[PDB]
Ligand SMILES: CN1N=C(C(=O)O)[C@@H]2[C@@H](C(=O)O)NC[C@@H]21
Ligand SMILES: [Cl-]
């Protein structure tokens with residue numbers, strides 16, 4: 001019979017996955033557009049499968065609590081409720097214990113998003129002061145980085161983030177961006193998203209450099225037969241320069 005339609009889990013995240021602007025409500029895959037949809041289109045052709053896009057119910061990428069329980073996109077793969085995770089899913093050692101990743105299709109690092117025209121120049125200045133609140137998206141890889149850090153400054157920053165019942169954390173990037181714009185708040189964010197936001201919000205800027213270096217990969221359940229095929233597909237898109245064209249399509253624009 002025809003090849004089974006694969007279930008792709010993802011999360012609304014600009015410019016990776018976005019609702020296509022329309023008056024008439026849209027249904028199925030046509031609801032979405034973005035870098036990851038274009039990536040899913042190319043992978044779909046190379047491997048030869050249809051796909052059905054489903055958003056993660058809790059809107060989280062995935063972290064494990066003190067009870068060892070995962071949530072978010074990672075948990076969807078563990079429980080075999082999705083065949084692939086085509087999203088900016090950060091490749092992390094802790095995540096590699098419970099799911100598989102393709103080779104990375106994009107590189108990034110943690111950095112700080114904040115308003116322009118301030119004397120804040122680093123995470124040290126941010127952790128050393130009191131006026132400015134700061135945090136990260138809840139139950140993402142950036143939160144996990146600070147939660148697990150063994151570095152003194154980042155340990156203090158996590159203690160600050162987890163205080164007052166984690167009020168410094170935000171539900172998602174969009175909520176975090178709005179918090180930066182409307183309050184005295186700095187968002188610990190991955191550099192690829194900062195590049196997108198700062199070009200379209202010329203009053204914001206990146207503070208300091210990268211405090212780590214990671215990559216995004218396609219997530220699959222352990223033992224998935226598609227992992228190696230997906231990796232081969234990513235490599236083909238690199239030699240063809242397609243991944244570069246996709247980046248420019250959804251990021252490149254007029255600078256501030
Ligand atoms: C870009 N977004 N920012 C994040 C963060 O944790 O800062 C998330 C991270 C993850 O996979 O957890 N990569 C996609 C999400
Ligand atoms: Cl892996």
Ligand SMILES: [Cl-]
Nearest residue numbers: 211212213214
């Ligand atoms: Cl590193």
